[PDB]
Design a protein around this ligand. Structure first.
Ligand SMILES: NC(=O)c1ccc[n+]([C@@H]2O[C@H](COP(=O)([O-])OP(=O)(O)OC[C@H]3O[C@@H](n4cnc5c(N)ncnc54)[C@H](OP(=O)(O)O)[C@@H]3O)[C@@H](O)[C@H]2O)c1
Ligand code: SF4
Ligand code: SF4
Ligand code: SF4
Ligand SMILES: [Zn+2]
Lengths: 385, 152, 53, 306, 111, 90, 208, 57, 176, 114, 71
């Protein structure tokens, strides 16, 4: 049998993920991919840093999420430190935490529609995506990778503006999602390109430990978005999509309705924000203000020491996970009792979502296999967990 | 000679007028180059076409972070390029490997393997200084082919 | 400002392409017209040409 | 003064200067000099792109590039004013259409037997050839021995090195064979009389320099390079077609980089196994390389498997 | 209905007695275990709690209430595996006491 | 104009939701200088340490470890089901 | 006490004190310590003889579904006289409850793997072999994932230093990309950060 | 069960390269940086290996 | 809650099949839809002519490093080492010394612009507000040997401009 | 030792296993040397195979040798197939590395006793 | 020794120096006991610090302030 390794080929998509194919003439029936192109030494590296200093290495763990990562870290730290965050701060973590889902669910369709080979829905949506990075630069520090969420809540307040901008932005977005509905849904060939492909629906679709979509849209109703709270996140109203059967085209149609939920939540979140503060007030965790660290005596000693070493975290293990826009996000943060943490093991999606490519692939073509991968939305560097 | 040296103001102009780059998407510096492909700072048709097969390349681009499991595969593609080539690496993890720099399994530099000509700094260079690096590269081509065999 | 690079402000019907600049000739000893890297602006227009104010 | 391991990023005391260093010989020598770590100062002639493949041998700050002609003086003086040792390997084959080609082996080793020597250098080493004799053969082979004596007036102690014919990867003599895909493969010249010379292997060449660069006491005591075992036969030309199973030129092509139906064809068929009283390679040890093991590497033709 | 909600199963076929066999299928195997472990004390407790509400009342939809599983065909799978669970309780012996106590200082966290 | 309605016969007719915000009615600038309220018990005479004890919470309580008609209590009450979001569930 | 302090609750602290109690009651063969976290988490310390059946008991029930294997990790602890610590984390789907399984081991002593019990441990179980050398029993395919092909270190333990020994470089000596002993341009300056005076009263050690 | 009780002093090797026999470790107590008087940094034994040359780059 | 998408049984009668028969046979689909949504070509191309035109930014944008000083030159840096201890890549290296006047200053001052990961914490750690991430992306030299910035780049680079820097701090210091 | 072994019991299921895969390496050394298209002599490969087995012969304890068996067998998984692209097999030979001195007078002129 | 690395590289060096630029300041005077130094402006520059000026009429530039302060 021919043993071609169609992978390292820089054939668009993402020139990585080099695997083997022991194809039985035309059908595959055996797929054993290799990973480890970026191992980077991540989990060993954090063992020498402090809590505030290690924080951007959670940010660079995806390619896409900037505020959904570091959402799974501060909320994994504030439980250890007996802190609730202040109420103005929680309305921003839901706002940017429900704006990164309008970055994955744009990239999760176009990049899938580029491996397939369509050109024009790649350029028709990233030109609208530019209207959104101006937000990131205006609020935090940079284009994408922002050390913005801290353990002491939000870093700083978003400036004057950004409320007649987001309302200006979000009132003209549903026309753009009505474009791709005409581009892909009512079309037949793309429907014929993906129906009854990847029919994985049994209880081994959950014994493989999958997280969401490539879950509930295939069947079993469950999510971490209204059975487990984060912040002020249950006080808004929305629904969660479910597809019919257990193929890719009934996990594709989650993502059209999923983007039709984030517009509602943003248009529901803006009406409910109170004026208030930014940081936690007790200042053993938050740094004091700049106009304060130049006047009093108490401000500097709880400033100058708070950057030489970090916080004082109590011992005892902990664990949590939140909704990453492609899955769960496990962090088993072992604390020791000093400024420097102990072991920090992460669970990212793709461990389950790509080990189950063995079950999902066989009985099918070779041209099916590239169409499988862009449905799970697998990003490397994120499989470094 | 005024006759012969007039000719390389076409040929050394023609190679800096049509560059067909390869991109190695490995890490977060890949994503920002896609926004350069997105038609705000529209990368196409300013002299340079989009993606292309690995055979027909002139300017290879290493972006992101190199691991020791990719150090053989980089050199083999680097051999298959034709002769008037150039290497330009964006991203602060291609100039010393950013941080991750003291890790046990990251290539220190992306310079101890391939010879690279233009160094753009930064976690993501914002697709704003990177067209500036490319216009630096066409500015670097002031070389000559005549008055090389005409001298020696 | 300043030399011959009259920064044209357009008719307020664009953004990203309303405040375009003109490079003409030999800012600090360069060539005539066919080599401009775009770094030749004085470090005061970075407040304005980048649309920061 | 030295420090620590000389694996990479060390100091090792020495500061050399290698001219030429763009051909087959001068590149591969420096690729050892950036491994132990030193201030390697390599000035090139007229080629910014032709040294691009050279740089990833010295780590960082160890190499440096300068420009020089050679018929000018200070360009060969400004660079060499801060060093310790200096070797030279400059030269080539056939006369240029613009140059003079005689004094290039006479005044150009003298141009760096200038104030260069007076500046305070030591262990200056030039290259020779085993077959460069004062006899009336050839136009290129002789007029190399003229530089062996007329420039030997300057630098009274040098240890000028004398190599035999070399074989490596991209030389000219061994690649003169099997580049002869033609309507007839003739040896030189249909006779098995004098073939062959002593093909020393290229690792032994670069190993002889680095032992001599702080030997010590190797100045004046000139050295010769032993070849393989032992003389060689006519079988070499048959050995080519048996196992083979029968850089700044121009933009299109160079008009004249020929096979040169002139005194090129005789400069190799003049063997001259010379005097064995030179010490010259085994004492500058250790260099011992056969031919039958390194022959698989350089030869490359259409079969590639069997 | 023709689709059972949770995709991957089929309504196959009859409620109210496919269950009623499988509870009683367990209870006969339940008597085989020697009674010193409290595994019997709670498992026979909930099956008699279940089967009393199972047997035998209309409708299918009423049997969904007061029996907290998924749909009724999936409630089979709630106890399908439990039959495979209790028969391996004879094979290994959890009713035996503790074995291999740890060496007297191990589960102390701060080093 | 005649090139206008050909865009209005093709793919509906929008005319207002352009792909550029480069025109007017994009928010240009904002004038005023900001000042931040300092609210959460930053003041004095009641706001006072040993009341705000944001840290120093005790160990995890050990339950019965080595060295009765129970109702077989579940870890939690089971998940009651969902509604169907009466907008267009089909 | 105030705002900006996490409001704890007692309902989940009650049932998780209730549920996990009769777990040790019905298998007093493998369970050696159970503890309740002060923020609604549970640990069931298990000697690894019962590595398969206790999972197999939590594999299925009518009062405990627990069929969502989320997290297999591995934590080393030197100065314990049995170093390593395999820790699971599993999820009840129908009940919204988290519980972890802490099973210690040592290096050379193997562990009966969870291959028939769960099929999400296909790539997780191999990872501990590549990073520590903990040879699990009877796995159908043990291989090398997330490391390079020539390592001998199992790096995620503590004796492996920050850099390796294998700083890689290229030469044009023939064609090869050859290994070499490791050489840095900078020390990785190691600080000293542990302030004295014991900020924590509750976790005070036995004073000996 | 296959208990097979036996006895050997466990010396493991092959995982480093050569620095078993080359170096010598040191076990000691860190004792009171005497710019101040906090005694929390007692109670824990530490280690540190041999120190070798530091040159100038 | 729920929603059941792509869950709709077909019509299956006499007349509505003619809407599904004219679809496949004569292609009233795929042209009315997909030939009109592409054209849609008459819109204005939103492209920035980069060497002439430039895009928007923010007043808090990061970039090139620089050092500030007081009115008439004082070296605002006080060498309190705090930017060093929070740099995640340890790109800072500072050796200080008592200068002969008496007040302490710096001798070596380094930013590994290769290693620099741009966490910007140096800008938010200096008490006397010395180091500032200056907003100019002008870069891209040709060697690795050049981007290691010594001190006499940075004071010079902090003095190629100041009015660019001094207006952005003065418009943003009230927030932070 | 209150610990169960891996495969062997005591030294005799062990020492027959290290002999076992030695033949699998021994027919592999001529098999790969024309496959990976590298050029040394084949007897050097057979010397380096027995080089590796003989060095670790100072073990008097089971399940460590058995631990090396799992290490020794996993080497063949990449080896029989093509998973080491012309570098990892060349990594066995410290070829371009400078020689260690290993002599007392030779160490004394260079180095601060490394 | 090091003088070879910049040949044809022109040695881009600083021009002004703050080694001694305090000394050209008009050293301030008050005739009081203790003075604030929020020099450079409020909420920027060096923090508030109080200096005794009784003894060889000076303060000592406050370290932070840098400007020569006296009476
Ligand atoms: N050991 C042997 O068997 C053997 C055989 C044949 C020849 N040689 C001689 O020994 C040396 C080996 O050279 P090679 O094998 O490496 O080939 P090569 O290409 O001739 O290298 C020698 C260098 O000298 C340079 N050169 C020639 N003329 C020059 C001039 N007027 N000014 C400055 N540079 C000049 C050449 O090109 P650039 O100008 O671009 O630098 C070249 O880079 C040469 O001197 C050669 O004549 C030795
Ligand atoms: S640090 Fe830079 S190169 Fe590395 S992933 Fe982030 S943006 Fe890309
Ligand atoms: S920014 Fe602060 S820490 Fe850094 S050199 Fe200046 S005064 Fe010192
Ligand atoms: S700019 Fe970034 S990397 Fe550099 S010192 Fe500041 S925080 Fe560290
Ligand atoms: Zn002052």
């Amino acid at each position: 049998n021919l043993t071609l390794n169609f992978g390292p080929q820089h054939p668009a998509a993402h020139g990585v993920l080099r695997l083997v194919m022991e194809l039985s003439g035309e059908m595959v029936r055996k797929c054993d991919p290799h990973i480890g192109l970026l191992h980077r030494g991540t989990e060993k590296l954090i063992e020498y840093k402090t809590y505030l200093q290690a924080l951007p290495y959670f940010d660079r763990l995806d390619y896409v999420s900037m505020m959904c990562n570091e959402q799974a870290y501060s909320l994994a730290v504030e439980k250890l430190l007996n802190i609730q965050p202040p109420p103005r701060a929680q309305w921003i973590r839901v706002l940017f935490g429900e704006i990164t889902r309008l970055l994955n669910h744009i990239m999760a369709v176009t990049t899938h529609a580029l491996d397939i080979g369509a050109m024009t829905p790649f350029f028709w949506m990233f030109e609208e995506r530019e209207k959104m990075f101006e937000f990131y630069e205006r609020v935090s520090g940079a284009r994408m990778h922002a050390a913005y969420v801290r353990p002491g809540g939000v870093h700083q307040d978003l400036p004057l503006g950004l409320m007649d901008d987001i309302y200006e932005f979000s009132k003209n977005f549903s026309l753009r999602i009505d474009e791709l509905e005409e581009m892909l849904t009512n079309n037949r060939i793309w429907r014929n390109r993906t129906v009854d492909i990847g029919i994985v629906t049994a209880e081994d679709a959950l014994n493989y430990g999958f997280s969401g979509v490539m879950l509930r849209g295939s069947g079993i109703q469950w999510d971490l978005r209204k059975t487990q709270p984060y912040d002020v996140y249950d006080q808004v109203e929305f629904d969660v999509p479910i597809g019919s059967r257990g193929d890719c085209y009934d996990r594709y149609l989650c993502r059209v309705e999923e983007m039709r939920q984030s517009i509602r939540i943003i248009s529901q979140c803006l009406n409910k924000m109170p004026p208030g503060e930014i940081k936690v007030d007790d200042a053993k965790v938050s740094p004091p203000k700049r106009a304060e660290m130049k006047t009093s005596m108490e401000s500097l000693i709880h400033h100058f020491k708070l950057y030489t070493e970090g916080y004082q975290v109590p011992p005892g293990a902990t664990y949590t996970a939140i909704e990453a826009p492609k899955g769960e996000f496990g962090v088993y943060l072992v604390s020791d009792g000093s400024s420097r943490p102990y072991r920090c093991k992460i669970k990212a999606p793709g461990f389950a979502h790509l080990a189950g490519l063995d079950k999902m692939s066989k009985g099918h073509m070779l041209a099916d296999v590239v169409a499988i991968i862009g449905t799970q939305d697998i990003v490397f560097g994120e499989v470094d967990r | 000679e005024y006759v012969v040296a007039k000719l390389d103001d076409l040929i050394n102009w023609a190679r800096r007028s049509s560059l067909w780059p390869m991109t190695f998407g490995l890490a977060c510096c890949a994503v920002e180059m896609m926004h350069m492909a997105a038609p705000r700072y529209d990368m196409d048709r300013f002299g340079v076409v989009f993606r292309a097969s690995p055979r027909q390349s002139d300017v290879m681009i290493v972006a992101g972070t190199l691991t020791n499991k990719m150090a053989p595969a980089l050199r083999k593609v680097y051999d298959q390029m034709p002769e008037p080539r150039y290497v330009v690496s964006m991203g602060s993890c291609a100039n010393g490997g950013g941080y991750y720099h003291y890790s046990y399994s990251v290539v220190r530099g992306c310079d101890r393997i391939v010879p690279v000509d233009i160094y753009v700094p930064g976690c993501p260079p914002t697709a704003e200084a990177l067209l500036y690096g490319i216009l630096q590269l066409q500015k670097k081509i002031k070389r000559e082919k005549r008055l090389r065999i005409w001298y020696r | 400002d300043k030399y011959g690079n009259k920064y044209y402000e357009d008719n307020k019907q664009f953004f990203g392409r309303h405040r375009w600049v003109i490079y003409t000739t030999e800012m600090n000893g360069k060539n005539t017209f066919w080599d401009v890297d775009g770094s030749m602006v004085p470090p005061e227009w970075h407040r304005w040409l980048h649309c920061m104010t | 003064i030295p420090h620590g391991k000389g694996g990479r990023s060390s100091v090792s005391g020495i500061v050399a200067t290698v001219f030429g260093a763009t051909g087959f010989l001068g590149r591969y020598v420096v690729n050892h000099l950036g491994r132990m770590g030193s201030q390697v100062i390599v000035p090139h002639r007229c080629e910014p792109y032709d040294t691009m493949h050279l740089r990833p041998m010295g780590d960082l700050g160890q190499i440096i590039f300068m420009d020089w002609n050679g018929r000018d003086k200070d360009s060969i003086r400004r660079a060499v004013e801060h060093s310790s040792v200096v070797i030279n390997l400059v030269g080539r084959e056939w006369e240029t259409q613009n140059f003079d080609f005689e004094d290039v082996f006479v005044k150009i080793p003298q141009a760096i037997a200038q104030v260069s020597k007076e500046a305070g250098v030591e262990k200056f080493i030039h290259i020779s050839h085993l077959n460069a004799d004062i006899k009336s053969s050839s136009k290129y082979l002789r007029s190399k021995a003229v530089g062996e004596k007329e420039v030997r007036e300057t630098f009274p102690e040098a240890t000028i090195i004398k190599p035999a014919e070399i074989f490596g990867r991209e030389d000219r003599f061994l690649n003169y064979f099997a580049n002869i895909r033609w309507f007839g493969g003739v040896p030189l010249i249909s006779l098995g009389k004098k073939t062959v010379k002593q093909p020393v292997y290229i690792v032994d060449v670069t190993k002889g320099i680095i032992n001599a660069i702080k030997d010590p006491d190797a100045r004046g005591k000139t050295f010769a390079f032993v070849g393989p075992s032992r003389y060689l036969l006519f079988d070499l030309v048959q050995y080519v077609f048996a196992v083979a199973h029968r850089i700044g030129r121009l933009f299109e092509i160079s008009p004249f980089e020929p096979w040169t139906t002139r005194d090129k064809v005789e400069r190799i068929h003049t063997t001259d196994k010379i005097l064995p009283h030179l010490p010259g390679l085994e004492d500058l040890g250790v260099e011992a390389t056969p031919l039958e093991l390194k022959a698989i590497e350089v030869l490359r033709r259409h079969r590639t498997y069997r | 209905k023709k689709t059972t909600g949770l995709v991957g199963l089929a309504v196959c076929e009859t409620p109210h007695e496919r269950l009623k066999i499988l509870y009683t299928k367990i209870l006969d195997v339940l008597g085989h275990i020697p009674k010193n472990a409290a595994y019997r004390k709670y498992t026979e407790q909930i099956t008699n709690e279940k089967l009393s509400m199972v047997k035998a009342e209309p409708d299918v939809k009423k049997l969904e209430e007061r029996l907290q599983g998924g749909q009724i065909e999936e409630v089979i799978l709630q106890a399908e595996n439990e039959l495979s669970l209790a028969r391996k309780m004879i094979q290994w012996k959890p009713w035996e006491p503790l074995v291999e106590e740890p060496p007297a200082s191990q589960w102390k966290w701060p080093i | 104009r005649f090139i206008q309605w050909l865009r209005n016969w093709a793919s509906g007719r929008d005319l207002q939701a352009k792909l550029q915000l480069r025109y007017q009615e994009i928010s240009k600038r904002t004038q005023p200088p900001p000042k931040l309220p300092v609210g959460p018990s930053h003041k004095l005479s009641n706001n006072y340490y040993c009341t705000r004890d944001g840290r120093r919470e005790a160990m995890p309580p050990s339950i019965v470890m080595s060295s009765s008609e129970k109702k077989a209590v579940s870890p939690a009450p089971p998940i009651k089901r969902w509604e169907l979001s009466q907008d267009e569930p089909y | 006490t105030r705002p900006t302090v996490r409001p704890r609750n007692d309902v989940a602290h009650k049932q998780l004190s209730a549920f996990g109690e009769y777990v040790a009651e019905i298998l007093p063969k493998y369970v050696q310590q159970v503890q309740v976290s002060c923020f609604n988490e549970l640990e069931i310390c298990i000697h690894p003889d019962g590595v398969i059946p206790v999972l197999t008991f939590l594999r299925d029930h009518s009062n405990a579904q627990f069929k969502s294997l989320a997290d297999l990790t591995a934590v080393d602890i030197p100065t314990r006289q049995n170093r390593f610590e395999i820790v699971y984390n599993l999820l009840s789907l129908r009940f919204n409850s988290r519980i972890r399984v802490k099973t210690y081991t040592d290096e050379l002593t193997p562990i009966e793997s969870s291959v028939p019990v769960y099929k999400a441990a296909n790539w997780y179980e191999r990872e501990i072999w590549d990073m520590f050398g903990v040879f699990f029993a009877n796995h159908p395919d043990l291989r090398r994932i997330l490391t390079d092909y020539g390592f001998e270190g199992h790096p995620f333990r503590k004796d492996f230093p920050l850099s390796g020994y294998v700083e890689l470089r290229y030469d044009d000596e023939v064609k090869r990309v050859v290994a070499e002993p490791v050489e840095l341009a900078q020390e990785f300056r190691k600080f000293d950060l542990n302030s004295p005076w014991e900020a924590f009263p509750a976790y005070r050690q036995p004073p000996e | 069960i296959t208990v097979d009780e036996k006895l050997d002093i466990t010396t493991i090797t092959g995982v480093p390269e050569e620095h078993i026999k080359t170096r010598k470790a040191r076990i000691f107590v860190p004792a009171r940086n005497n710019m101040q008087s906090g005694v929390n940094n007692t109670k824990k034994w530490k280690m540190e290996f041999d120190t070798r040359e530091r040159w100038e780059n | 809650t729920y929603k059941y998408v792509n869950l709709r049984e077909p019509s299956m009668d006499m007349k509505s099949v003619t809407d599904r028969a004219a679809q496949t046979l004569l292609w009233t689909e795929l042209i009315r839809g997909l030939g009109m949504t592409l054209s849609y070509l008459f819109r204005e191309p939103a492209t920035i002519n980069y060497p002439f035109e430039k895009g928007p930014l923010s007043p808090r944008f990061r970039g090139e490093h620089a050092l500030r000083r007081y009115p008439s030159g004082e070296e605002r840096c006080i060498a309190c080492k705090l930017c060093e201890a929070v740099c995640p890549a340890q790109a800072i290296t500072i050796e200080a010394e008592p200068r002969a006047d008496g007040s302490r200053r710096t001798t070596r001052y380094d930013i590994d612009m290769t290693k620099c990961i741009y966490c910007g914490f140096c800008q938010e750690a200096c008490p006397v507000d010395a180091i500032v991430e200056g907003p100019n992306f002008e870069f891209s030299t040709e060697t690795h040997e050049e981007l290691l910035y010594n001190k006499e780049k940075l004071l010079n680079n902090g003095d190629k401009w100041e009015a660019e820097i001094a207006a952005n701090i003065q418009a943003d210091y009230l927030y932070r | 030792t209150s610990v169960k072994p891996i495969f062997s019991r005591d030294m005799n299921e062990a020492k027959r296993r290290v002999r076992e895969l030695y033949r699998a390496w021994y027919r592999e050394v001529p098999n790969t040397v024309h496959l990976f298209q590298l050029d040394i002599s084949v007897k050097q490969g057979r010397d380096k195979v027995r080089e590796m087995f003989k060095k670790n012969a100072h073990i008097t304890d089971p399940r460590v040798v058995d631990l090396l068996v799992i290490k020794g067998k996993m080497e063949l998984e990449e080896t029989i197939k093509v998973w080491k692209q012309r570098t990892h097999v060349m990594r066995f030979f410290h070829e371009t590395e400078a020689p260690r001195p290993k002599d007392f007078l030779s160490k004394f002129y260079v180095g601060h006793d490394p | 020794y090091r003088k070879v690395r910049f040949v044809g590289r022109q040695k881009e060096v600083n021009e002004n120096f703050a080694i001694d630029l305090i000394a050209e300041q008009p050293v301030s005077q008050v005739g009081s006991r203790v003075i604030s130094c929020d020099g450079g402006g409020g909420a920027l520059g060096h923090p508030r610090v109080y200096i005794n000026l009784d003894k060889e009429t000076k303060t000592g530039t406050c370290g932070y302030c840098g400007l020569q302060f006296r009476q």
